[PDB]
């Protein structure tokens with residue numbers, strides 16, 4: 001009937017619930033565009049696999065009962081938690097790429113967001129079976145258990161099953177297990193709270209001669225990832241004070257607090273509920289700009305930073321965009337745009 | 341030696357440590373100007389007494405001491421947690437209401453914490469460092485006071501019939517006292533729940549300042565802290581919502597304002613963060629507010645009190661707002677002032 005079905009998911013991992021929904025869409029349309037959300041990030045516990053691995057996983061799963069691969073296309077989406085129009089444009093870009101000859105288009109499926117966001121397209125609704133829970137799957141996986149009832153295949157050499165089986169031997173699997181054990185122990189310790197906690201953190205975006213100051217993380221979450229210098233707000237300091245305290249603790253930047261105060265452009269809040277794996281963490285980020293300086297200030301890593309670097313804007317920043325903590329690539333992008 | 345000395349305190353309440361320091365100020369100057377900090381706020385456990393009450397208390401203790409009251413003047417200072425320049429000027433306005441045409445002026449504060457601040461902000465005035473062994477604990481005194489005990493070693497007067505000591509004896513029979521004790525018990529219990537947590541909490545709240553035809557929407561509080569006070573509508577941020585959503589969710593819950601989500605999204609001017617660490621008695625609470633401006637609107641939307649709001653009212657700017665200025669929750673007066681200047 002439709003020329004095109006639009007299908008959006010995380011696929012962390014791809015399962016039978018996904019295969020049956022694609023199948024409903026392929027008997028309602030001639031071609032499916034599968035849009036994988038949350039790409040171009042480093043692996044974390046909620047997002048273990050890359051775009052390429054998930055794309056592969058999907059293809060080799062579809063290639064087993066049935067399915068014509070000529071009727072299927074796969075495109076990536078980045079996260080834009082604070083700039084939803086960008087996300088919308090990017091999805092529209094992915095679709096216009098495959099449907100620009102007045103093709104008939106429907107979104108197969110956050111059912112209300114897609115209905116509000118995309119009036120141009122029809123919404124094919126799908127209620128599934130027993131709740132295929134991606135968290136439950138992943139938590140058993142970091143415990144050594146692939147749940148074969150989720151798997152498209154039954155053969156451990158076929159599909160996601162084979163990918164998941166082999167993945168358990170990788171270094172990335174270990175890192176993720178380590179991160180997950182950290183978070184379980186961290187979350188446990190906080191069940192004491194009379195009320196579920198919001199964490200308040202601070203970060204500093206410091207630009208000197210078109211370089212951004214970044215820290216490589218010594219500890220979980222995001223161990224060995226690059227990040228803005230920052231950490232927890234303390235009960236006795238203002239946000240503005242915490243921003244500078246963490247900056248100096250982690251990087252020992254050779255600037256005075258007065259200089260940084262003159263260089264300060266703004267402070268923004270980042271409050272996407274799932275930005276961090278510890279629990280709900282709101283970050284206040286200060287932007288500091290030195291259009292020019294005789295040189296890059298001296299920096300020395302300390303505390304939870306195992307390294308610190310001045311990294312130039314443009315290509316060098318883009319090249320570590322998938323080696324950064326949490327939403328820090330978005331934060332950098334936003335603050336330089338609007339503050340700026 | 342100096343014509344004027346300048347002395348700043350909260351005096352919640354005035355005590356022997358304060359007296360001690362005013363005696364030094366007067367060995368070094370001919371007139372001392374006493375500035376009472378945190379004036380014009382409603383009574384809270386940390387600030388139980390009004391400006392007038394503290395003034396009375398100081399005058400009566402200085403008679404007991406007995407310092408000639410012609411050598412003493414008393415002026416109020418409001419709080420400006422977020423507008424440090426309004427405070428510096430307001431002080432200067434206090435000092436020069438009294439010092440005139442080439443008086444030598446000294447500030448007499450603690451050589452320890454607030455030494456730095458006064459040196460920098462008031463270079464025109466000299467400094468007289470004070471502080472002596474004693475460790476007079478303001479908090480320690482109020483806690484015992486909320487348990488029914490006036491600590492004698494704090495009292496300038498040994499006689500319960502006189503001075504601050506008398507004032508506090510009589511104050512203990514009032515309803516305000518009873519409301520302070522109740523707030524205190526609430527706060528002690530609130531904090532007890534949190535003693536176990538691996539880290540001290542920073543609490544996150546939201547408020548909405550909604551202005552329709554120069555009227556602020558304000559709730560009157562059902563629960564602690566600041567019971568029976570007027571506040572911007574607001575409350576705790578939940579874990580599964582953004583701050584933008586929280587601000588609107590709490591607005592509806594407390595006021596049932598007859599406006600739509602898109603109508604408020606259009607009316608929204610800005611959000612501001614309020615993070616003075618001692619702004620709330622519960623523990624460290626940061627607030628994100630929430631400015632919404634409706635101009636030349638056909639009518640004031642319909643509202644009704646629910647959840648922790650027991651009343652809700654449209655309050656016109658200007659006269660009716662300064663009227664309840666000392667009847668507001670925590671720093672909401674300051675928050676309203678700031679959001680009107682910088683966003684509206």
Ligand SMILES: Nc1ncnc2c1ncn2[C@@H]1O[C@H](COP(=O)(O)O)[C@@H](O)[C@H]1O
Pocket residue numbers: 199230231232233246304539540
């Ligand atoms: N919820 C929390 N509140 C305050 N401090 C914390 C919290 N969780 C961890 N920390 C401390 O902060 C350290 C990490 O550095 P940073 O995140 O830069 O402040 C950890 O090693 C903890 O000791």
Ligand SMILES: Nc1ncnc2c1ncn2[C@@H]1O[C@H](COP(=O)(O)O)[C@@H](O)[C@H]1O
Pocket residue numbers: 195196543563574575576577590648
């Ligand atoms: N730390 C907290 N986090 C979330 N909700 C809370 C917290 N403390 C108190 N509350 C709830 O908020 C109520 C008061 O309403 P509100 O302050 O307007 O959200 C109390 O009755 C509590 O149920």
Ligand SMILES: [Mn+2]
Pocket residue numbers: 171174
């Ligand atoms: Mn290994």
Ligand SMILES: [Mn+2]
Pocket residue numbers: 229230231232246250304
């Ligand atoms: Mn840190």
Ligand SMILES: [Mn+2]
Pocket residue numbers: 231232246
């Ligand atoms: Mn820290």
Ligand SMILES: [Mn+2]
Pocket residue numbers: 230231232246249250303304
């Ligand atoms: Mn740190």
Ligand SMILES: [Mn+2]
Pocket residue numbers: 211310312
């Ligand atoms: Mn370089």
Ligand SMILES: [Mn+2]
Pocket residue numbers: 573574575576594648649
């Ligand atoms: Mn409330």
Ligand SMILES: [Mn+2]
Pocket residue numbers: 574575576590593594647648
């Ligand atoms: Mn409420």
Ligand SMILES: [Mn+2]
Pocket residue numbers: 575576590
């Ligand atoms: Mn609430």
Ligand SMILES: [Mn+2]
Pocket residue numbers: 555656
């Ligand atoms: Mn009116």
